Amino acid sequence: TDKLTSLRQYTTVVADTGDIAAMKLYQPQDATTNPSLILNAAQIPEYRKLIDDAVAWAKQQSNDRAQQIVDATDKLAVNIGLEILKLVPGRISTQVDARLSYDTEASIAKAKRLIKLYNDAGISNDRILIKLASTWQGIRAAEQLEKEGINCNLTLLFSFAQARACAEAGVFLISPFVGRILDWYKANTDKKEYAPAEDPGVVSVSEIYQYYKEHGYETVVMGASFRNIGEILELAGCDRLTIAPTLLKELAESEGAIERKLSYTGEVKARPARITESEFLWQHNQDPMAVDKLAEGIRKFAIDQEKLEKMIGDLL
Template sequence: MSAPSALQALRESGIRISSDTAEYHQILEFKADLTDATTNPSLVLAAVSKPEYADIVRDAVNFARGRLPSASVREMSALAMDRLLVQVGAQISGIVPGRVSVSVDPRIAHDYHAIIRKGETLVALLEDLRIPRSRILIKIPATYEGIRAAQALEHPSTGEPIHTNMTLVFGRVQALACAQAGVSVISPFIGRVKDWWDVNGGAASELSQHPGILLVQNIRSTYAAHGYTRTQIMAAGFRAVEEIIELGKYGVAGGPDLVTLPPNLLDGLRTRTSLGPALKFTPHPINLATAPHYFGGPDSTNGASLYARDILEERIADTKVPEGLAKFSVDAQILEDLVKRKVLESAEVSAML
């Protein structure tokens, strides 16, 4: 019997594998090893820029024209863009058995009410496509307003909850706030964490000292110490197969519940054998007495000011979140412009008939 691949070994360690692409034709190749999937506007833009995904843009535009026949181009384009995002998610949900993350617009990352409205809209559109909300994660940037909005979606005063995946997580402050808010999933960005520490703390010489890996281990230790069992860790933004293998050696006990990976890294794991020897995880020491309460707890009335103070002190998220939002927002605007052009083209064709 041949040795299992690193991809199989990672799955057998208890860590679930998620695909990180909107190019759903590529996901089929890895279907046997996948449980979940993630998308975002940047990934959708990359997909629909290819000829083989052109039909899905046309279908989204036709849907919007049919649903809002008398609407302005702006309103029609907004609905077409939302429909495009959920159509990609629906296609992927037919391939993976677990949950699919669909993103809100990164340009509303600091607008509490807009995030809630967008989350509800995306879920309603997915349910129109017969995707139950139990299989949906609404991906929201982990700003303070984003975490507040996620809390409201996860714990509504009436109606069914909408589950969330908090993206652009770079530090322990964000991770702690998300768990206190009771979100379903957080996504720490392994590679970008290392980028920041390479500049601000010096490059690590050993993989075991990789700042992104250490962050995941710190979050795992923090959640275990506090008893935060609701919120799962989905490690994202890996740059190399070696990072995944190193983190995977600790299994779920010292690593993430899930990893989300683009096709090139899935393929890289598939062509490597094993993860190497499993490593015993020693939890990081956590002082529960000094833990701030951003959401819930006796001092949570000052949660916003405590969060702002601690984010500034920790520094990394204060830099990396705006940087990540800027990149995603550029791609969201390009995608919106593409959809708007298609809406205008369809209107011109309709006027000629």
């Protein structure tokens, strides 16, 4: 049989898309969206009914234009989540407005707003992960949300500082990125091609996994962002991996069995004192790749949120 089926022996497979066709086809445990994927999903013609439901619901919630745009985009992201939840047994990840990434209180508020929308549609909190960028502020938002029974997916995770802070905050799940790390190394070093074991994204997720297991942290490690099946296969054994349909297709069509790569067997070690905000800021900014890419992912996801608001704006 196939590499996708072999991988599911070791790793829970998650679909990185807003497209329901992919859920029918690959039957993943969970799904992840983000604002770019939400923007792309809104172009699917069969999803016009979901945009229409969102716009109509928004107009019923208030008579103010600014608030209707905000309500409709939020409701659209949730509507897509609801469709996906019909087809996956596990969780949907839905990302908060990236414009709030450096504001803890606004992020907590928005996370709660989305959770309410899901709850009001009949969905309980154990079906949802609210996606927040792994800034200090997002990590603080998440720590508080976890205490209020809202589980979070900490995304755009590039630096070890970020990984340590998320563990210490007790977040439900992290999404350490692989492909964007590779992207950065190509664009900023001499070395433009990498064996899978040398892929610096793969090295990053592997080192994070080890650290998490060796200190007994229970935060789920979900590798995300992939450029090729080599990266994915080198990470077999990661708790979860979220994978775009293109690469799911490739795995499903490749014959053969693969080995588990990622494991920890040793003793549980003593945890250190919690990293403080100053230590975290210092160690994060030691990593020029992480500096660039965290900020960039936030900028891009915000642009896509604006585009989503422009689109909705034209329909009110």
